[PDB]
A paper describes a structure:
To neutralize chemokines, ticks secrete small cysteine-rich chemokine-binding proteins in their saliva with no homologues in mammals, termed Evasins.
Each of the N- and C-terminal subdomains consists of a three-stranded anti-parallel β-sheet core, in which the sheets are oriented orthogonally with respect to each other, forming an L-shaped structure. The 3D fold of [name] is tightly arranged by four disulfide bonds and contains a rigid protein core. Three disulfide bonds connect β-strands within a subdomain (Cys27–Cys46 connects β1 and β3, Cys63–Cys94 links β5 and β7, and Cys84–Cys103 connects β6 and β8), whereas the fourth disulfide bond (Cys42–Cys89) joins the N-terminal subdomain with the β6-strand of the C-terminal subdomain. The crystal packing reveals a large intermolecular interface of 2,380 Å2 buried surface area common to all three [name] crystal forms.
Numbering used by the authors:
A (entry chain A), B (entry chain A): 18 to 104
Protein backbone atom coordinates (compact mmCIF):
# COMPACT_ATOMS: atom_id res chain seq x y z
CA UNK A 1 0.00 0.00 0.00
CA UNK A 2 2.87 2.40 -0.95
CA UNK A 3 2.14 6.21 -0.69
CA UNK A 4 -1.48 5.14 -0.01
CA UNK A 5 -4.42 7.25 -1.31
CA UNK A 6 -5.76 9.77 1.24
CA UNK A 7 -9.46 9.16 1.99
CA UNK A 8 -11.73 12.11 2.78
CA UNK A 9 -15.21 11.34 4.09
CA UNK A 10 -17.80 14.14 3.92
CA UNK A 11 -21.39 14.06 5.15
CA UNK A 12 -24.40 14.98 3.01
CA UNK A 13 -28.18 14.55 2.91
CA UNK A 14 -29.63 11.89 0.57
CA UNK A 15 -32.22 13.11 -1.93
CA UNK A 16 -33.84 12.35 -5.25
CA UNK A 17 -31.58 15.12 -6.72
CA UNK A 18 -28.45 13.45 -5.28
CA UNK A 19 -26.26 14.18 -2.27
CA UNK A 20 -27.01 17.64 -0.84
CA UNK A 21 -24.80 20.10 1.03
CA UNK A 22 -26.46 21.93 3.93
CA UNK A 23 -28.12 25.33 3.53
CA UNK A 24 -24.86 27.11 4.49
CA UNK A 25 -22.87 25.25 1.80
CA UNK A 26 -20.34 24.05 4.40
CA UNK A 27 -19.84 20.28 4.63
CA UNK A 28 -18.43 18.34 7.60
CA UNK A 29 -15.48 16.20 6.49
CA UNK A 30 -13.02 13.80 8.08
CA UNK A 31 -9.50 12.91 6.97
CA UNK A 32 -7.55 10.02 8.57
CA UNK A 33 -6.61 12.49 11.35
CA UNK A 34 -9.07 15.45 11.64
CA UNK A 35 -12.68 16.80 11.44
CA UNK A 36 -13.20 20.12 9.63
CA UNK A 37 -15.56 21.97 7.31
CA UNK A 38 -15.09 22.38 3.60
CA UNK A 39 -16.94 25.07 1.64
CA UNK A 40 -19.05 23.54 -1.11
CA UNK A 41 -18.14 24.49 -4.69
CA UNK A 42 -20.28 27.12 -6.42
CA UNK A 43 -23.32 25.49 -8.08
CA UNK A 44 -23.19 22.37 -5.89
CA UNK A 45 -26.68 21.09 -4.98
CA UNK A 46 -27.71 22.16 -1.50
CA UNK A 47 -30.67 21.86 0.86
CA UNK A 48 -32.75 25.07 1.01
CA UNK A 49 -35.63 23.91 3.24
CA UNK A 50 -37.10 20.79 4.83
CA UNK A 51 -40.87 20.74 4.72
CA UNK A 52 -42.25 18.43 7.45
CA UNK A 53 -44.04 19.00 10.79
CA UNK A 54 -41.31 20.23 13.15
CA UNK A 55 -42.41 17.77 15.92
CA UNK A 56 -41.45 14.81 13.62
CA UNK A 57 -37.77 15.69 14.00
CA UNK A 58 -38.21 16.26 17.79
CA UNK A 59 -39.68 12.69 17.88
CA UNK A 60 -36.55 11.58 15.86
CA UNK A 61 -38.79 9.96 13.15
CA UNK A 62 -36.75 7.97 10.54
CA UNK A 63 -39.00 8.67 7.48
CA UNK A 64 -38.43 10.39 4.10
CA UNK A 65 -39.73 13.90 3.64
CA UNK A 66 -40.32 16.72 1.18
CA UNK A 67 -37.40 19.13 0.86
CA UNK A 68 -36.36 21.91 -1.53
CA UNK A 69 -33.03 22.05 -3.35
CA UNK A 70 -30.95 24.97 -4.52
CA UNK A 71 -27.39 25.61 -5.64
CA UNK A 72 -24.42 27.03 -3.74
CA UNK A 73 -23.66 30.68 -4.56
CA UNK A 74 -20.64 32.18 -2.77
CA UNK A 75 -20.95 30.07 0.38
CA UNK A 76 -24.79 30.16 0.76
CA UNK A 77 -27.53 27.97 -0.78
CA UNK A 78 -29.58 29.94 -3.37
CA UNK A 79 -32.90 29.32 -5.00
CA UNK A 80 -35.22 29.27 -6.81
CA UNK A 81 -36.20 26.06 -4.99
CA UNK A 82 -36.78 22.71 -6.73
CA UNK A 83 -38.82 19.96 -5.08
CA UNK A 84 -37.14 16.77 -3.97
CA UNK A 85 -37.59 13.91 -1.53
CA UNK A 86 -34.91 13.66 1.21
CA UNK A 87 -34.11 10.88 3.67
CA UNK B 1 -29.67 7.90 14.13
CA UNK B 2 -32.86 9.16 12.36
CA UNK B 3 -32.55 10.05 8.59
CA UNK B 4 -28.78 9.52 9.10
CA UNK B 5 -26.23 11.67 7.22
CA UNK B 6 -24.96 10.10 3.97
CA UNK B 7 -21.17 9.63 4.02
CA UNK B 8 -19.20 9.96 0.79
CA UNK B 9 -15.56 8.89 0.85
CA UNK B 10 -13.32 10.13 -1.99
CA UNK B 11 -9.65 9.34 -2.58
CA UNK B 12 -6.96 11.98 -3.09
CA UNK B 13 -3.18 12.39 -2.96
CA UNK B 14 -1.64 14.03 0.12
CA UNK B 15 0.57 17.05 -0.55
CA UNK B 16 1.99 20.19 1.01
CA UNK B 17 -0.68 22.11 -1.02
CA UNK B 18 -3.47 19.92 0.42
CA UNK B 19 -5.47 17.00 -0.96
CA UNK B 20 -5.00 16.69 -4.73
CA UNK B 21 -7.31 15.34 -7.43
CA UNK B 22 -5.63 13.28 -10.16
CA UNK B 23 -4.41 14.80 -13.43
CA UNK B 24 -7.75 14.00 -15.13
CA UNK B 25 -9.74 15.82 -12.41
CA UNK B 26 -11.89 12.72 -11.80
CA UNK B 27 -11.94 11.39 -8.23
CA UNK B 28 -12.86 7.87 -7.12
CA UNK B 29 -15.63 7.99 -4.50
CA UNK B 30 -17.66 5.52 -2.47
CA UNK B 31 -21.14 5.93 -1.00
CA UNK B 32 -22.60 3.38 1.46
CA UNK B 33 -23.58 1.31 -1.62
CA UNK B 34 -21.45 2.14 -4.73
CA UNK B 35 -18.05 3.12 -6.27
CA UNK B 36 -18.07 5.83 -8.96
CA UNK B 37 -16.14 8.82 -10.25
CA UNK B 38 -16.97 12.42 -9.53
CA UNK B 39 -15.61 15.25 -11.68
CA UNK B 40 -13.58 17.69 -9.61
CA UNK B 41 -14.88 21.27 -9.41
CA UNK B 42 -13.22 23.88 -11.60
CA UNK B 43 -10.16 25.36 -9.81
CA UNK B 44 -9.74 22.39 -7.46
CA UNK B 45 -6.07 21.56 -6.80
CA UNK B 46 -4.87 18.66 -8.92
CA UNK B 47 -1.71 16.66 -9.56
CA UNK B 48 -0.01 17.64 -12.84
CA UNK B 49 3.17 15.52 -12.62
CA UNK B 50 5.11 13.30 -10.23
CA UNK B 51 8.84 13.83 -10.46
CA UNK B 52 10.70 10.74 -9.17
CA UNK B 53 12.69 7.91 -10.83
CA UNK B 54 10.04 5.69 -12.46
CA UNK B 55 11.65 2.49 -11.01
CA UNK B 56 10.84 3.75 -7.43
CA UNK B 57 7.13 3.21 -8.07
CA UNK B 58 7.82 -0.19 -9.74
CA UNK B 59 9.69 -1.10 -6.49
CA UNK B 60 6.55 0.15 -4.58
CA UNK B 61 8.71 2.54 -2.45
CA UNK B 62 6.70 4.25 0.37
CA UNK B 63 8.59 7.61 0.40
CA UNK B 64 7.54 11.25 -0.21
CA UNK B 65 8.39 12.82 -3.54
CA UNK B 66 8.45 16.02 -5.57
CA UNK B 67 5.26 16.66 -7.53
CA UNK B 68 3.71 19.59 -9.40
CA UNK B 69 0.25 20.99 -8.72
CA UNK B 70 -2.24 22.69 -10.99
CA UNK B 71 -5.93 23.53 -10.99
CA UNK B 72 -8.88 21.78 -12.63
CA UNK B 73 -10.11 23.49 -15.82
CA UNK B 74 -13.12 21.86 -17.50
CA UNK B 75 -12.30 18.30 -16.43
CA UNK B 76 -8.48 18.40 -16.95
CA UNK B 77 -5.66 19.57 -14.65
CA UNK B 78 -4.07 22.82 -15.95
CA UNK B 79 -0.84 24.58 -15.16
CA UNK B 80 1.30 26.56 -14.80
CA UNK B 81 2.79 24.04 -12.34
CA UNK B 82 3.59 24.83 -8.69
CA UNK B 83 6.07 22.72 -6.72
CA UNK B 84 4.86 20.58 -3.86
CA UNK B 85 5.84 17.51 -1.88
CA UNK B 86 3.45 14.52 -2.20
CA UNK B 87 3.17 11.31 -0.19
Amino acid sequence: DYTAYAPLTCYFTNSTLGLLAPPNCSVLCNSTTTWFNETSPNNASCLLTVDFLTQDAILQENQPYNCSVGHCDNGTCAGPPRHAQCW
